[PDB]
Amino acid sequence: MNAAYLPSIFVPLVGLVFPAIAMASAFLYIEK
Amino acid sequence: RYFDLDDLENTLGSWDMYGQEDQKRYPGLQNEFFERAGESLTRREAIRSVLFLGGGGALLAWGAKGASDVTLPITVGPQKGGEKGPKG
Amino acid sequence: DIAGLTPCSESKAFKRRENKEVKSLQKRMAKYEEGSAPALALQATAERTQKRFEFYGKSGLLCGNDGLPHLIADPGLAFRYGHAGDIMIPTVLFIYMAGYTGYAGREYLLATRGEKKPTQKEIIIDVPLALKCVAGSAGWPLRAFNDLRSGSLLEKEENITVS
Amino acid sequence: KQVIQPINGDPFIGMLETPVTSAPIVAGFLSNLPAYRTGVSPLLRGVEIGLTHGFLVAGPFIKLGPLRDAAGGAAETAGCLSGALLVIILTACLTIYGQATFEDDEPQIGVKTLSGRDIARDPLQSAEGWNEFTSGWLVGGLSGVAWAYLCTQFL
Amino acid sequence: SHNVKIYDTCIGCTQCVRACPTDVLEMVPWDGCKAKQIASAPRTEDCVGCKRCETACPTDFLSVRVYLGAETTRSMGLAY
Amino acid sequence: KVKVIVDRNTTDTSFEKWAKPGHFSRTLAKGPTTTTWIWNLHADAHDFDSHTSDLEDISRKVFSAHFGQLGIILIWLSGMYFHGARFSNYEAWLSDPTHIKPSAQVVWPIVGQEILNGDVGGGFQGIQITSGFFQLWRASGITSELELYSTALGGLLLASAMFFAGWFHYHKAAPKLEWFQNVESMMNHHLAGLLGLGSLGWAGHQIHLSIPINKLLDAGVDPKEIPLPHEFLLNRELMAGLYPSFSAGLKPFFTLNWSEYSDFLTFKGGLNPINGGLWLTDIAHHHLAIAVLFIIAGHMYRTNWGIGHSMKEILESHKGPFTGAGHQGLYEILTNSWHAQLAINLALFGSLSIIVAHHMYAMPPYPYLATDYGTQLSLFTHHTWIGGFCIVGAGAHAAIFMVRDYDPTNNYNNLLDRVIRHRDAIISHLNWVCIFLGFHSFGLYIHNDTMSALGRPQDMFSDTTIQLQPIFAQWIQSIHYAAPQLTAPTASAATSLTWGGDIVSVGGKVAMMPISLGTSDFMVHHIHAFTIHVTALILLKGVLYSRSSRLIPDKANLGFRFPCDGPGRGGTCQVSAWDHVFLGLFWMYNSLSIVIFHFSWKMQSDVWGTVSESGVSHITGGNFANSANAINGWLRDFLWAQSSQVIQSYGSALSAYGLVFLGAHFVWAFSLMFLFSGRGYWQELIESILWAHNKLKVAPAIQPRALSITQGRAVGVAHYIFGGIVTTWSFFLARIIAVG
Amino acid sequence: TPPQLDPNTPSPIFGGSTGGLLRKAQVEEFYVITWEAKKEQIFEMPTGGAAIMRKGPNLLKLARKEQCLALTTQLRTKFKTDACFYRVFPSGEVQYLHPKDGVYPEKVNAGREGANQNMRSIGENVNPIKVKFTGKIGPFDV
């Protein structure tokens, strides 16, 4: 598969980081 | 009878309970070192985002990099023999 | 024969099915000496059960592979091929059983309708008036046609609707 | 006598004073904490408050973590690193609560003391007072976990 | 704020106005009625939505029909 | 002051008013306008606060109707003895109890249902019995069938005396209010008269009948040679042979040395390792010791003679600083209102049943309850549920008092008052305790569930893994097995064997062995605690907010039982104090149901099964503390595993459990129709069907109306609980009647 | 004639309870009741608990207009006294709520000009097409 190191890079980014940012930014937009 | 309608501040019982008056009870020996260590990050969106963008990157970094992984399908993982079903 | 079935009398699994029950039953009644009614009660059921087998085999029901008697709906099948007693006859029985109580419920509501207050007449039945209806209900097929053609069966267009 | 009364006069206010509300001890204690004082900078609270919550949070991780077996003391740093995350996560939460409730323009909404006296409102209300606290929390929050590690490999 | 509107059919029984826990409906005199009286709703502000009105109308189909709108601090009835 | 004071010929006994349904309440007397009048009749029939006003009219109806319940219970007891007389195998059981299984009910042959008669024993065919009459009737010294007919008749005779008492005390001679207002007399009598004398009377039955008889049985004689009962009290020399101290007569009782009776009055403790029951010598020494103590305790209330307390003084003399006026109001509440005095009764008298379920379990006081496991199980599950409902009774009627019988003018700065006032604190804290246990009690299984499925057993809380052990409970069992040394110096041994004692066998079965409390035992009790709190939240909230809540200030004027107030305020749906009992019944149901599954499969794991000599192999082979930590093994090892007894039975004796098992699913799933749906959809649909009947001119004169809101909620709970309990009923019996 | 101000009328004797004002009152409006008394006796308090009303004109502070008329229906139908109440909010100005006309709405007066009325029977309303994409709250407005 030759790419093998990718999942360790993405899954945390897409399972945590993005849900961390999209949790913050989507919040700050609820009240303005 | 209570009233004093000229003040609606005392009619609401809104009084802060445990807030004290006393000014700083903290020593100047340790004061002047911290007081200038907090404002290095003072700002709304350019710092909080440093915590998201730059801070959360150790999940990325040490999730991939350091070989401290325990039973992780990432790294150590499968090393034993693979299971085969009954049919194939 | 029909639909890849066989009459239960010439079936086989059906004959297992009959003679496997008595075995399990009799091996059970060997635990009771004849001076016990349980020796009699079990005996009487084994003889009771064999009666129905000689009945189901005789009457000509159709047992499929399992040996359990099936039925057949279509009139053109039941009738022509000789066994209509499964539904085709009792489907007539039921309707006369059901419509009888059906139409006996309509007259009572008519007879009790015009009064001062029909409501209390629905809670507390006067059984004589209900008996005169239970009697009168018989032959409802001929009495339904007549309320049908005379125009007294329906209430026509003074019914209430919404919009 | 009767020990229990409504709060300070008016009975029609929601709470009513009890021994854990208005007492000699509880009035003083909860007031001594680096929380309710009106006389100290908000930066100095976060470096106090957050400084503590780093140390005590390390314990669960550095004791009952996923990996509780290491010959290099890695069971301890594995808890320190993760306990340092709830330091980094809660900073996002803290700062978020500032851009929501407090408007830079709107003044302090805090109320005035316990008795007759109106004293200057809580220096921490608005974002300025709040943000100084948040970075303060981050300053101390790092220390607590740090000294927790130093206290793990020493002392 | 909820909407409440009233119709020709009123008998003026006042039985609505007795119901409102926020005292919205208030009886305005009128002519064509048998008792020459008609309700009316000066405050759509404080209609909470109880529809204790619509239960009280002796009229076959109601003289008042509450149409729930959006809901404010008052129309949610918040003590918080 | 305390007199009889009755009226005369108050009402008129005639059928005049039977033919006039709804005659009681002014609203119903007008006959049905709609179909609801049929429903609104039944719910209002036994509500005596809607009928009338004064306590004379209410109480008479209440008192005269208790005779009704007692007249029904006795027709019930009579029937149970009669079916012990004719249709039971009892004699055959009585001779060889270690084998024959108990049976009474016999099935008529028709409709091919006689297969329900199981081959059991004593040359007999009938249904199994889990009730436990046989193992009572042995302990009462009842041998022949003639004693049973004499109870059946005598029971059915005295039953007829009650309904006459019921008739006589309502129509003919009805007491006045003042008579029902005497508590201190009533409490002197009940406590001394019922319980005090009723214990002696029974302590006099055991001494002259059960103690002698049950010695001749386990000695190896059988009912054929047993002297008739009246032989025992009419012959000393016969009695003295059994116990020599009867030769002493009544002198030792009068000469005031009771150590003389140590033969037939003992203090022992522990189970008799022949019958398995408690040693029947001290049970007489039990009731006797209690009876003497009750009659004492019945004299503390004065009536005529100025000796003994009053009530009003006892309560009004307790005033603390914290509580203000203490109890000054409680007396005139509890003597002026029934629902108040009912909530207090159902509270204790409910939970007393649950307490019984532990004791009769933990130390069986009957011969041969051990060798029949279905009876010990069926009587642990029975009394819990019956104690479970009667608790929710307290939740419901306390709420009825608030809404209706409660007036402020009597209690001001009271203990009742000061509770309503801070209520937001009570409910809030309880509401936190539940959420606390929610994650800790329950969530720890989810950890155990997950850590399993991730292949890391090193983590899941267990015995090998992280130790969570019931320190205290374990530590308690230490004292009581060290008790018959110093803290209990005069004893044979410890009270029961669940403590640190040793195993006991009969008929190759385990009577009771000790029970060890492991981690899985720890985790469960906190789930018991979790449910018991949550179900207190719901009932307490129903009482405190019954009157008025913060969001609905008038709530009292809407009655005890009402649907929502508005759709407004985001909707008020289901805010009433009848509706907090609606909700409490699903948590009661849930709470108790798991109390059982804890019991049933702890008891099979760590106690029951045949004595194998070597290995003492249990029913499940002793898998609990390992088996069930996570919710993982509750499906596999319990429901799945245990339910393979009920499913494979068709054509067997217990097959009627296989039908009921499913039949209890259908009724349960059927409940969801009434809980999830709502009225206005069902009232719209009926509007269509009327068009059909109209078109055929069949329209009824009592207009069909869909069930009312709270009606549909009740029939929703009725089935959800009904269908759900009947499963475990069918699941237990089919299980153990096969296995045990 | 109808409106009045807020003189000094004491408050009824009560010992405190968790029912009452909250942090609305700080930022948000809250109500005030004034009635009178003849004898002193006890009255249900709608926020919970019982309270002793004084021998004369009284003043309370509740949290809702809803709670407020609960207490008027109380004293009007039970002790048979009139009551009238206010809307007080922190900006300092008070409004006179309740019989603004000077008469309870249950009884007819003159001078009231009623709003929110429709001169059509209900069946005579518009069907939702005829207000489409133009928009109104509903068919009842048009």
Ligand code: CLA
């Ligand atoms: C994609 C989703 C995702 C990912 C990648 C992880 C990843 C992880 N989880 Mg986690 N978890 C998740 C979802 C996820 N989780 C969810 C949804 C739940 C709730 C159902 C949990 C509940 C949970 C529990 C209860 C626990 C974990 C633990 C862990 C760690 C595994 C054990 C280990 O080796 O730690 C060893 C870790 C290290 C040696 C160092 C990690 C520290 C990194 C490198 C620094 C991160 C920097 C950054 C500031 C983090 C904040 C992010 C944010 C600011 C953007 C690993 C970091 C365990 C844990 O955290 O213990 C340590 C643990 O106990 N998880």
Ligand code: CLA
């Ligand atoms: C005896 C009076 C009577 C009569 C003539 C009818 C006639 C009818 N009903 Mg009906 N119905 C009745 C009583 C009656 N119903 C009662 C008492 C109930 C429930 C309380 C219903 C509930 C009901 C429903 C829910 C539906 C009908 C429907 C129908 C129509 C189709 C027939 C059918 O399949 O029903 C099937 C019948 C049932 C499912 C239940 C009937 C149960 C029995 C018959 C009621 C007892 C009768 C009564 C005791 C007789 C007393 C006699 C004595 C006083 C002399 C038909 C017009 C269906 C319809 O409109 O389709 C067109 C339909 O959906 N009915």
Ligand code: CLA
């Ligand atoms: C609550 C207690 C209870 C229960 C659950 C049962 C249950 C049963 N008994 Mg039983 N029994 C009881 C008490 C009870 N009994 C008592 C107290 C006695 C002593 C008198 C008996 C004596 C007895 C005998 C002698 C027999 C049973 C039998 C039976 C079984 C079948 C009964 C049957 O089909 O009815 C049959 C139903 C009828 C004959 C008529 C039913 C409808 C009538 C008309 C109702 C009467 C009107 C009214 C409502 C009731 C009386 C009021 C009056 C003023 C009019 C069944 C298991 C039989 C059995 O098990 O056979 C193996 C059997 O032979 N029982």
Ligand code: CLA
């Ligand atoms: C020694 C005196 C004595 C005794 C034994 C009892 C016994 C009883 N009372 Mg009672 N009572 C008494 C004095 C006594 N009372 C006095 C002085 C008052 C006046 C304040 C009351 C007022 C009172 C009320 C208001 C109520 C009772 C109730 C009861 C019953 C309890 C419920 C139960 O489960 O019974 C269990 C039942 C049994 C164990 C069966 C035994 C029953 C037999 C018939 C013994 C009854 C003896 C009793 C004293 C009547 C004898 C006199 C009479 C025959 C002329 C029970 C039968 C309750 C009840 O059931 O109401 C009917 C109830 O509501 N009592």
Ligand code: CLA
């Ligand atoms: C299985 C179904 C189910 C569940 C889980 C609950 C859960 C709950 N009910 Mg309940 N309820 C149910 C069915 C259920 N109910 C039904 C059918 C009825 C009808 C009668 C009711 C009626 C009812 C009433 C009347 C009351 C409750 C109450 C409660 C709460 C008690 C506090 C608690 O345990 O929180 C703790 C939470 C849990 C035990 C859930 C476990 C989940 C795990 C441990 C946490 C997950 C970790 C993490 C967040 C994962 C998410 C991450 C992801 C987003 C990435 C709780 C939320 C009571 C309440 O709120 O007061 C306290 C209350 O008064 N319920």
Ligand SMILES: CC1=C(C/C=C(\C)CCC[C@H](C)CCC[C@H](C)CCCC(C)C)C(=O)c2ccccc2C1=O
């Ligand atoms: C199913 C359902 C209905 C419909 C169910 C109804 C209308 C029950 C009516 C059926 C009754 C039981 C039929 C009664 C038949 C008569 C007793 C006549 C019988 C005479 C002999 C045959 C015995 C509601 O009305 C409803 C209302 C509110 C919330 C939920 C629901 C709900 O879930």
Ligand SMILES: CCCCCCCS[C@@H]1O[C@H](CO)[C@@H](O)[C@H](O)[C@H]1O
């Ligand atoms: C005898 C068993 C059947 C029960 C019904 C028989 C009586 S029939 C009964 O006769 C009464 C005479 O006044 C009428 O009032 C009543 O309406 C009628 O139903």
Ligand code: SF4
């Ligand atoms: S609205 Fe209904 S109730 Fe109110 S007045 Fe007009 S008619 Fe009478």
Ligand code: SF4
């Ligand atoms: S719904 Fe709106 S209008 Fe109808 S009563 Fe409740 S508040 Fe007054």
